Symmetry: C4
Subunit: 461 residues, 4 copies
């Protein structure tokens, strides 16, 4: 009879929860737990996205306002990773002096709720530091020299800092000039909700940088905002977020227990089944359960990081967003397990799994050609094309070209001044596009759609 029991157990382990309830009236509380997990994970992600969106928007708006206030002739958009640049010793001095003067007159210029902030030494003021190669006759040692400009110093009606010997820069040895100051800000966008407003501290540095010594000074503006207590403010939900993240952890922790319990009970049946198939003469490792375990781990980690961020009032949410986003992606991918219960949808999951090994084998061959083209394009078209400047950019450009993106602009960005490089670029682009788009991907398509012929006839039989 134990043979019949083993057969009935193996039949039970292979049927859908709907069929389990139809047959043996076993309630699918694990399925309900998973649906609840989907709903709560998505809810937590959406709430987190909305709140952190608000905070990031406030910080970026303040940074843009600071750039308009302190960078002379700022166009409103960054030239590059740096905000603006100058090419003349006079434009350089005017940019520096403009920044200092705008800081002096901050209260009469700003449109927001800005104020001067105490620095790291607990004194309101402006710090200017400059680095020179100490001296045609220059040593490699950099001579740093700083000055602390108070509000009293800048507010002297005859200004003495402008004429001081500090601001006479020898631009041929200059490495950089850095201006540092602190500002205190309040977002009044929140007080309509009776929430006490959040007070932020901005640590701003303007770097007038010519490490390149190529005739251009690049001006970088960096604003680092942190959240501090509102020391002085009179304006006539932390628990709810924290408990919700605890419920998400508990549910995800419970799903970890149930899935691992399910996997263990599956391996027990494999042990039993081999016994009946050792005397008479991935099936029990569900690949969906591995995905569910990874998703639960990532959701727990992301929730712990989120609670830590909210507890100690931090504003960088990158790593927590990367864990929560990946876990949500995997949860929504794992919903495909419930659809695959209905065999009508299963034949479409099987057609992808069958095509995967041929795709991987084919990527090995196409990958080598792709790498060769990447190296060639970087070494040749690097000095003459902005889509080929470094290797990572070349890889992305070739990927986009394979997908047809921006072909004419890519062809037209090579100036015909060098005839040899122009001819080579034409040959390179034509050969890469023809080869990859018309042999490589056609063979690839052919491999996949026809492998999907066999799953289609294999399920018919």
């Amino acid at each position: 009879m134990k043979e019949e029991c083993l057969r009935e157990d193996l039949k039970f382990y292979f049927m859908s929860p709907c069929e389990k309830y139809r047959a043996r009236r076993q309630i699918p509380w694990k399925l309900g737990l998973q649906i609840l997990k989907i709903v709560m994970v998505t809810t937590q992600l959406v709430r987190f996205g909305l709140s952190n969106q608000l905070v990031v928007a406030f910080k970026e708006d303040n940074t843009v306002a600071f750039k308009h206030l302190f960078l002379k002739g700022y166009s409103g958009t960054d030239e590059d990773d740096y905000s603006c640049s100058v090419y003349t010793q006079e434009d350089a001095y005017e940019s520096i002096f403009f920044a200092i003067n705008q800081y002096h007159q901050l209260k009469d210029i700003t449109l927001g709720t800005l104020g001067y902030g105490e620095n790291e030494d607990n004194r309101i003021g402006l710090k200017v530091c400059k680095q020179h190669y100490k001296k045609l006759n220059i040593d490699n040692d950099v001579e740093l020299d700083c000055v602390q400009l108070d509000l009293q110093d800048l507010s002297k009606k005859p200004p003495d800092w402008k004429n001081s010997s500090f601001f006479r820069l020898e631009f041929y040895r200059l490495l950089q000039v850095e201006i540092s100051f602190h500002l205190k800000g309040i977002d009044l966008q929140t007080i309509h909700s009776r929430e006490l407003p959040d007070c932020y501290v901005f640590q701003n540095t303007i770097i007038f940088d010519n490490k390149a010594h190529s005739g251009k000074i690049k001006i970088y503006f960096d604003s680092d905002a942190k959240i501090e207590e509102c020391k002085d403010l009179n304006i006539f939900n932390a628990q709810y977020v924290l408990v919700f993240d605890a419920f998400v952890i508990v549910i995800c922790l419970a799903s970890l227990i149930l899935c691992t319990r399910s996997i263990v009970l599956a391996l027990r049946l494999r042990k039993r089944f081999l016994n009946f198939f050792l005397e008479k003469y991935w099936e029990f490792i569900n690949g969906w359960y591995v995905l569910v375990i990874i998703s639960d781990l990532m959701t727990i980690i992301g929730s712990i990081l989120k609670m830590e961020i909210k507890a100690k009032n931090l504003t960088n949410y990158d790593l927590c967003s990367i864990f929560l986003g990946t876990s949500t992606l995997l949860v929504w991918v794992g919903v495909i397990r419930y659809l695959g219960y209905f065999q009508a949808y299963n034949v479409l999951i099987l057609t992808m799994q069958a095509s995967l090994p041929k795709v991987l084998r084919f990527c090995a061959c196409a990958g080598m050609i792709y790498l060769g083209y990447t190296f060639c394009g970087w070494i040749v078209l690097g000095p003459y094309h902005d889509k080929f400047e470094n290797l990572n950019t070349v890889a992305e450009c070739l990927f986009s070209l394979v997908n047809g993106d921006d072909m004419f602009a890519t062809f037209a960005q090579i100036q015909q001044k060098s005839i040899l490089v122009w001819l080579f670029s034409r040959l390179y682009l034509y050969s890469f596009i023809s080869l990859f788009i018309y042999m490589i991907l056609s063979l690839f398509i052919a491999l996949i759609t026809d492998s999907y012929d066999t799953i289609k006839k294999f399920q018919q039989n």
Copy 2:
């Protein structure tokens, strides 16, 4: 003999009108009615589009002229949903004062036929309203304060409004400043046709908005134009439009009667046929007739809304255009019924219907992956990418990426300042594009083109 009669009736119901006329000399006046309906529906839509195009063009041109007249240093294109922005207390005051001064000198500045308009209180002038948080020590109650500036007040040779205590704004509590005025305009573009010119009233508001309190004031210019009687004007087709819309209603109403009569007579034959197949041992619901009924309903509704709009002289034609456009789309789709009479074209309508269920089943699986990627991309790349700012934008970006659109720019819009987010964006984009473009759509293609193998061999047999 009644069996022969039933067979002849079922044979009659299944033959094309061309065959009906060839066999029993029955004139296809229903087909002629449908062709007339196609022609008149398209004619009405084209006439409506041309006229409303004219009106919208006039309104937009006047709005652009107003922005150039009243917004200081307007670049000619909107920065965003708002027209322009300022970052300094002095630029803010100059924008406000420029708007007021340009309104004062309107007659000497405008190039069109503009005049001052009486406001809601029937007095020519300008209204300025400002909102502050009533008072570091601010309450949540907003204190509104308005002033009505007449033409006499602005025309005083020593201007007193500039120096008044109203325009001393405390920008740290300011919520917004709103300037409201009315203008009367005439389009003389019509008088070449003996038509009396249409006189419009523009209700203009300029909003100097800093609800964000982020250091930037956004300036919104909104012009609401309505059509009024020309009270004073001396310049040395309504019936035709209204009757035409009545004929469109009648024809569409008639097509509703005939199609519903046809459907009822079809269900009678189903009743009869089952009787012969209950003793001896969608075919009668034509899916085209459902489309024709929906199209007739939408055309009647759109025509009624159109007549209402023309009767009471309204200028918002959105809902009427959405009904008329959808009804015209459905009419031109329904022309495919006449082509499908010829079986040579029928095998191509059958190949799409057969492929539809597999497409829908496949969308369920691909939709879950798409949703997971949407959530992940929004939560992670939202703060660092303008194509991922909100969920709807992320969905559109992923759709465009699947279709290959703007891949290199999408790859290049992530600044490499955060190495972790940059690496994740690379992984995210590569995985999404590879997965969707090379497994998902290949299986999809394979499903559809091969299902079109079976209709092709199924019609051969």
Copy 3:
């Protein structure tokens, strides 16, 4: 024996010229004539393109220089079909006065070889014409008023034209102001080749246009250049072009004779062959010969127009370029006849011809859906999208969308201010793209590639 003669004739008519020479030693002078025709037609087209490219470049460069000289604050690129626009009565007067003043000082401002030209009345000067509605109280009659400003009038040291009653414009009735003048130019780019330089006459009009009466004056600059004799010039190939165009006509005329002779001799064999198949019990109309006849006609017409243009010194080469370009396209398409002699390439011409009827039948069904979407998109998204403004633009936008072009920008160009139209645009774009790109074109592909299965197995058997 006449039966054997008929069979031998039909065998002769169906073999390639290479086989004709291999068998009966018949020289293929017709093939040599066709190769000569290809070479000479392409040569004529290339020479014509190079010369007319030079002339067009000169004219466009002069027009750009004129726009910079006479249009105030010209940005260097046209705003629209019009060059620039103004919105103020003062900017309007300054633009007009700037144009007149720059004309007065032309000799001291121009960088080229420009001079004043006599007008249609043979007098050097400037003409200003203005149109008003003759007079709140305006009649539909337009009152035109012109003034002729001589160089003496503009050169009076106290200028009297500025203060004259002519230039007091009532902008509320103004239709337009037009400024007309002539300039004489010489291109010295030619004298390096001993060719006498070509002297051109520019007829320039500046139109300050506010027919719309919408508050904006659009400024159009039109320069019409013609070539005249150099009356006064001292600088210390017409036959060759004309004879070459005569040889092209002769060769194309000869090819017309030979092809029509070939077609007639083909129809004689059809007559004979039916006689043998009327007692015993496109094959003779070569579709390539129709193409060759059309190409010869077009080349002769284009050459005649080209000779006429060169004879009477005209500078508009549009119609001649459209005939020559189409004839060259058809010649290079007709080269496919020689490749199709080798049966290895023939099976690829047969696969396209076989697929054509299914493509045409399918376009009829897809065309109706395309038309419905075009009408719907124009009526709804016309007022809110610049890619949907008129019907032709909508058709091009839908074509590009089917080919995947600029999908994200199309999705993002609809402002979300109107929620109803925004939702409809989302639904419209998603439905059109999904439908056309994933059912319509998949069925199409499937039709074509599989019809190419049958030609591939039909030639095997």
Copy 4:
């Protein structure tokens, strides 16, 4: 027994090196040599790319700074191949005078380590040369006139060069004005590494060019930088690069010997095998070895050019980069030989080789249509479209259109001013896109994927 020996030799020659070592314990030192070659070739290319990237970046940054210093009102981006342009005799004089004045005040304006350089005559100064047609009455001989402006001449407090008769240009005969000077620069970006800094000499020419005589002067700025010894400089790895390039040559030279030895031993076996198949009754030319020989030749040539460049301190690395990049591309393509040892990957290399002849035969037919469309589009749309200006641009535009790139912009770049050309452009673009994208490429796909059906069933059998 010699028959058995011949069979064993032929079996040895056809087995993979892994199988050779598995069977006869023969170490695959040739395979190890090839892997070492891959690693060292890639290493050399990456090092070369990084260093030449640094040098090119320095030169381009200095050129940009020079353009900002000496070109008046330079926008920061080049208008075209020329940097900027002027249209007035006054803007022309101001640009020339601005360049000369900025050169005079170089030491007080530059942000980098710039100094005056001795010219070709070994004298510090500025040279201005002008070309006129010597004199309505102009001869074809160009009269060149130069002036050498010293620092003493420009530094005279009353400047005499401005008022001199040299700078009175007759712009109607002017061909060009050229300003030439030398600058000495040092990149201090290197001294942090104890490397003595590299001193560069810049030979700058500003060309005020109006050869066209079309009313516009184009201003070209060309900077030619070379590396010279630092004559005067006090700042408190050549061998390693040179030896590494020698090892790359040796390894590539060795691979040439081994591959050619392998090919010869292969042809010996062909000779022997035919003997056994001459009495009883590409297989021995490996196509990979041809690729390896070509790659070794190119790597040796590129390394020799690289050593020559580094030895004599040259800064143009184009030809050397084209040889090294092509050789690296071919090395990474040749790695596909090792994967093809495993027959699982071999069937994917065989499917491409089998499809190649059909692709080539098909390109001959499609190429003729492509050429016809190219000629037609250039001759017709050349004067009205910037993507059709010359034949090479037309070819690239049609290639991009076939790949779907920028279709709507291509459709919209034709102004509707000429109705005939506009209609023809619509017809041209629609016909080309429909034809090529929907018949030509569908037949092509069909040819390739189905040929990949036969290799797939041919390897099964």
